[PDB]
Design an enzyme around this catalytic site. Structure first.
Site, PDB file in Angstrom:
ATOM      1  N   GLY A  49       0.798  -1.359   0.116  1.00 49.01           N
ATOM      2  CA  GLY A  49      -0.049  -0.038   0.047  1.00 49.01           C
ATOM      3  C   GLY A  49       0.936   1.485  -0.056  1.00 49.01           C
ATOM      4  O   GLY A  49       1.978   1.383  -0.178  1.00 49.01           O
ATOM      5  N   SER A  50       0.165   2.459  -0.149  1.00 47.82           N
ATOM      6  CA  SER A  50       0.613   3.768   0.031  1.00 47.82           C
ATOM      7  C   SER A  50      -0.255   4.797   0.435  1.00 47.82           C
ATOM      8  O   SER A  50      -0.234   5.602   1.422  1.00 47.82           O
ATOM      9  CB  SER A  50       1.172   4.049  -1.334  1.00 47.82           C
ATOM     10  OG  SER A  50       1.206   5.406  -1.528  1.00 47.82           O
ATOM     11  N   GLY A  53       2.670   7.680   4.495  1.00 51.04           N
ATOM     12  CA  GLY A  53       3.619   6.333   4.548  1.00 51.04           C
ATOM     13  C   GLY A  53       3.801   5.322   3.555  1.00 51.04           C
ATOM     14  O   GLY A  53       2.476   4.922   3.186  1.00 51.04           O
ATOM     15  N   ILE A  54       4.691   4.588   3.273  1.00 54.63           N
ATOM     16  CA  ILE A  54       4.802   3.674   2.321  1.00 54.63           C
ATOM     17  C   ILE A  54       4.968   2.356   2.915  1.00 54.63           C
ATOM     18  O   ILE A  54       5.760   2.166   4.099  1.00 54.63           O
ATOM     19  CB  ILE A  54       5.846   3.666   1.214  1.00 54.63           C
ATOM     20  CG1 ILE A  54       6.048   5.001   0.677  1.00 54.63           C
ATOM     21  CG2 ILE A  54       5.864   2.457   0.333  1.00 54.63           C
ATOM     22  CD1 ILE A  54       6.993   5.160  -0.159  1.00 54.63           C
ATOM     23  N   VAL A  55       3.970   1.071   2.708  1.00 55.92           N
ATOM     24  CA  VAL A  55       3.926  -0.031   3.332  1.00 55.92           C
ATOM     25  C   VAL A  55       4.373  -1.462   2.607  1.00 55.92           C
ATOM     26  O   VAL A  55       4.016  -1.300   1.793  1.00 55.92           O
ATOM     27  CB  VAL A  55       2.258  -0.324   4.169  1.00 55.92           C
ATOM     28  CG1 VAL A  55       2.551  -1.179   5.198  1.00 55.92           C
ATOM     29  CG2 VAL A  55       2.060   1.053   4.344  1.00 55.92           C
ATOM     30  N   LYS A  97       6.144  -0.024   7.854  1.00 56.15           N
ATOM     31  CA  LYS A  97       5.766   1.469   7.311  1.00 56.15           C
ATOM     32  C   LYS A  97       6.890   2.267   7.526  1.00 56.15           C
ATOM     33  O   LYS A  97       7.265   2.663   8.447  1.00 56.15           O
ATOM     34  CB  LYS A  97       4.442   1.864   7.970  1.00 56.15           C
ATOM     35  CG  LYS A  97       3.769   2.868   7.463  1.00 56.15           C
ATOM     36  CD  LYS A  97       2.681   3.603   8.234  1.00 56.15           C
ATOM     37  CE  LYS A  97       2.010   4.909   7.887  1.00 56.15           C
ATOM     38  NZ  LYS A  97       1.123   5.349   8.594  1.00 56.15           N
ATOM     39  N   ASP A 146     -11.973  10.640  10.104  1.00 56.83           N
ATOM     40  CA  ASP A 146     -11.457   9.991   8.607  1.00 56.83           C
ATOM     41  C   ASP A 146     -11.785   8.747   8.440  1.00 56.83           C
ATOM     42  O   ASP A 146     -10.965   8.007   7.855  1.00 56.83           O
ATOM     43  CB  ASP A 146     -10.043  10.640   8.637  1.00 56.83           C
ATOM     44  CG  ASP A 146      -9.778  10.686   6.895  1.00 56.83           C
ATOM     45  OD1 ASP A 146     -10.362  10.815   6.300  1.00 56.83           O
ATOM     46  OD2 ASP A 146      -8.914   9.920   6.606  1.00 56.83           O
TER      47      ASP A 146
HETATM   48  O1  35F Z   1      -2.600  -7.831   1.282  1.00 53.54           O
HETATM   49  C1  35F Z   1      -2.492  -8.402   2.114  1.00 53.54           C
HETATM   50  N1  35F Z   1      -2.569  -7.964   3.474  1.00 53.54           N
HETATM   51  C2  35F Z   1      -2.889  -6.813   3.664  1.00 53.54           C
HETATM   52  C3  35F Z   1      -3.902  -6.015   2.911  1.00 53.54           C
HETATM   53  C4  35F Z   1      -4.190  -4.481   3.344  1.00 53.54           C
HETATM   54  C5  35F Z   1      -3.805  -4.028   4.287  1.00 53.54           C
HETATM   55  C6  35F Z   1      -2.941  -4.594   5.265  1.00 53.54           C
HETATM   56  C7  35F Z   1      -2.466  -4.180   6.438  1.00 53.54           C
HETATM   57  N2  35F Z   1      -2.115  -5.070   7.749  1.00 53.54           N
HETATM   58  N3  35F Z   1      -1.304  -4.215   8.602  1.00 53.54           N
HETATM   59  C8  35F Z   1      -1.393  -3.094   8.275  1.00 53.54           C
HETATM   60  C9  35F Z   1      -0.750  -1.728   8.656  1.00 53.54           C
HETATM   61  C10 35F Z   1      -0.791  -0.624   7.943  1.00 53.54           C
HETATM   62  C11 35F Z   1      -1.286  -0.694   6.745  1.00 53.54           C
HETATM   63  C12 35F Z   1      -1.388   0.784   5.747  1.00 53.54           C
HETATM   64  N4  35F Z   1      -1.692   0.861   4.570  1.00 53.54           N
HETATM   65  C13 35F Z   1      -1.701   2.099   4.295  1.00 53.54           C
HETATM   66  N5  35F Z   1      -0.849   2.754   5.188  1.00 53.54           N
HETATM   67  N6  35F Z   1      -0.879   1.715   6.226  1.00 53.54           N
HETATM   68  C14 35F Z   1      -1.740  -1.750   6.162  1.00 53.54           C
HETATM   69  C15 35F Z   1      -1.830  -2.848   6.773  1.00 53.54           C
HETATM   70  C16 35F Z   1      -2.606  -6.123   4.842  1.00 53.54           C
HETATM   71  C17 35F Z   1      -1.937  -9.777   2.229  1.00 53.54           C
HETATM   72  C18 35F Z   1      -1.881 -10.646   3.165  1.00 53.54           C
HETATM   73  C19 35F Z   1      -1.351 -11.808   2.903  1.00 53.54           C
HETATM   74  C20 35F Z   1      -1.317 -11.826   1.549  1.00 53.54           C
HETATM   75  O2  35F Z   1      -1.877 -10.373   1.087  1.00 53.54           O
END
Ligand code: 35F
Ligand code: 35F
EC number: 2.7.11.24
Lengths: 326, 342
Positions: free
Chosen positions: A26-27, A28-30, A45, A141
């Site tokens: 995702g996108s 901090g960049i994670v 992150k 939010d």
């Molecule tokens: O995509 C997978 N998991 C997933 C999907 C969406 C979110 C998270 C997520 N977990 N913990 C977090 C902490 C922060 C963020 C964050 N995203 C933006 N900003 N911060 C995201 C997470 C995890 C996955 C698992 C196994 C195989 O694919």
């Protein structure tokens, strides 16, 4: 401690050697990362230039302090925090290590959930929000993308506080209270059931129009709470009677494969009708939502509140650095 | 036109539409038969009032039953289909037959069955709804027990009668009775006044029995009833006991002291019905702990019990509320009752 560097999706991650095979989520960049001390996948992150101004440093200090103090089952867990820098003088980057989930709510909107699962997700959302409210935090939010789930239907809130989920009072520049977050829950609930965004405005002002067309022009009692100039705008919009909730959320969009679904459908629509209320004076509270028939089935009668501002950019930097180092 | 039949050593004289009478219920105030109704093509319940005109209390109660049965219309209160008398004039007038919807069983029969959380909570929701409708009409039953509740095989539940008139007095525990009274509220037993939540104690006793498969407070006689209460719930407060009538107060205060048993011990996990059952069990026990409370000041109300997690899951916000009902010498009673029959 020792670190290593890896280029991940247009960025350079410098992390503890324990976090391996990083891949973006995702996108901090994670990134997802395998932790070789714990033997599990985690989320890593990297904060986006945390001290570029007044806003960023304020936000990042808050995020870090709250993640460290808050311990609730429906709020994301912080596992580790580090910096690759060794002095306050060269200090640039902050890394947050959090529990890795399976998906965010945008992804679950695309599925066909039964009442049991929908109500359990909503129960958890409200529990997370209640805990935030008890600590003095009003989120403002909440949206599908900052709420995450596991495949066993566990739900956690990602942050401590886009247009589609903003309460009427925010749109009109009024003040707000705790139940501003109830509007957002109503919007998310509607979308889970419907499969599409309830109020899809082209702009922040078109947002009000979308609300009015569906729920109708709000009462004169509500109008009275507006400043005359804001009220003039509201009253110069075309008038709408509003659409009945039986019409907005018809039986067929709800699960209907058994007879016990009929009553849960009446309950779900009833809750929606109490959350999606323009006037915050008349909108359900978090505590009443938690006691609603659709939700309260999940309550177990058999969590401590957390032990919890303008500065120069350098003063913020030393505050953040102190938080990373203990 | 009428015909007579000898039913369980009693003689019924009924309209000819009512055929193949078979007894289903006994007792004072009424003897009850199932009958096939040839006009409606359904089986019904025919109740012959057990001598309504023997004294003023009998005639009062008979008049009340008939008036209330007519005026009340709620899905969890027994529906009256017809009323008739075999006699042709007011001078002749003697017997009253009440015709009601026929159910499948008394709750006595289904209590002690192996029932899941879903059926149990649904039965209790329905009971609460009937009681609330009574309360909103100014009717406090005060004598609820499984024998005045009836059920269908689909779990539909109805209350059979209207219990005691509001201004009726009761006899406390020191005054003897022959029969069993396992469901009587502590305030009735102890000679106190009563308020609306007198009926919540009864529901608590019924809930506990549905779960356990045995009578919760099974006293050997009228006084032992109180010992069974205190042994499990514990001696109530000094303040509570001090406010009782001397006859009661002296007995109750000189009883051995009991700490009471924790509800996790009284109603342990293994007596309750997956992982979904785990939270429901916890909720059920919580409701029981709030209903089975000696002191009525500290006992849950009907409104509050209806909003409980265990119960409120059966609440349908869309369905219309049932509108509230539109409410002497033994020979003046007769004329009053005759007009209700005709
Ligand atoms: O995509 C997978 N998991 C997933 C999907 C969406 C979110 C998270 C997520 N977990 N913990 C977090 C902490 C922060 C963020 C964050 N995203 C933006 N900003 N911060 C995201 C997470 C995890 C996955 C698992 C196994 C195989 O694919
Ligand atoms: O036994 C059956 N049903 C049953 C059993 C117990 C009560 C009732 C009952 N239905 N309606 C009523 C009205 C009054 C009374 C009443 N009992 C004392 N006093 N009044 C009882 C009923 C019905 C049955 C049905 C089909 C085959 O067997």
């Amino acid at each position: 401690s020792q670190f290593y560097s890896v280029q991940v999706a247009d960025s350079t991650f410098t992390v503890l050697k324990r976090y391996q095979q990083l891949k973006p989520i995702g996108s901090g960049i994670v990134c997802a990362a395998f932790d070789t001390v714990l033997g599990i996948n985690v989320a890593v992150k990297k904060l986006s230039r945390p001290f570029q101004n007044q806003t960023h440093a304020k936000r990042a200090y808050r995020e870090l302090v709250l993640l460290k103090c808050v311990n609730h089952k429906n709020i994301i867990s912080l596992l580790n925090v580090f910096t690759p820098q060794k002095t306050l003088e060269e200090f640039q980057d902050v890394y947050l290590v959090m529990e890795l989930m399976d998906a965010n709510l945008c992804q679950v909107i695309h599925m066909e959930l039964d009442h049991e699962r929908m109500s359990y997700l909503l129960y958890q959302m409200l529990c997370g929000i209640k805990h935030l409210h008890s600590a003095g935090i009003i989120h403002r939010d909440l949206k599908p993308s900052n709420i995450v789930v596991k495949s066993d239907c566990t739900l956690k809130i990602l942050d401590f506080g886009t247009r589609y989920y903003r309460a009427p009072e925010v749109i009109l520049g009024m003040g707000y209270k705790e139940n501003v977050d109830i509007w957002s829950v109503g919007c998310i609930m509607g979308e889970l059931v419907k499969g599409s965004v309830i109020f899809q405005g082209t702009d922040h002002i078109d947002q009000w129009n979308k609300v009015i067309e569906q729920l109708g022009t709000p009462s004169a009692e509500f109008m009275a709470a507006l400043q005359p100039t804001v009220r003039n705008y509201v009253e110069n919009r075309p008038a709408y009677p509003g659409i009945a909730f039986e019409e907005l959320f018809p039986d067929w969009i709800f699960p209907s494969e058994s007879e016990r679904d009929k009553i849960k459908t009446s309950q779900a629509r009833d809750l929606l009708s109490k959350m999606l209320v323009i006037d915050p004076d008349k909108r359900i509270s978090v505590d009443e939502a938690l006691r609603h028939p659709y939700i309260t089935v999940w309550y177990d009668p058999a969590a401590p509140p957390p032990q919890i501002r303008e500065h120069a950019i350098e003063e913020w930097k030393e505050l953040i650095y102190k938080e990373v180092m203990d």
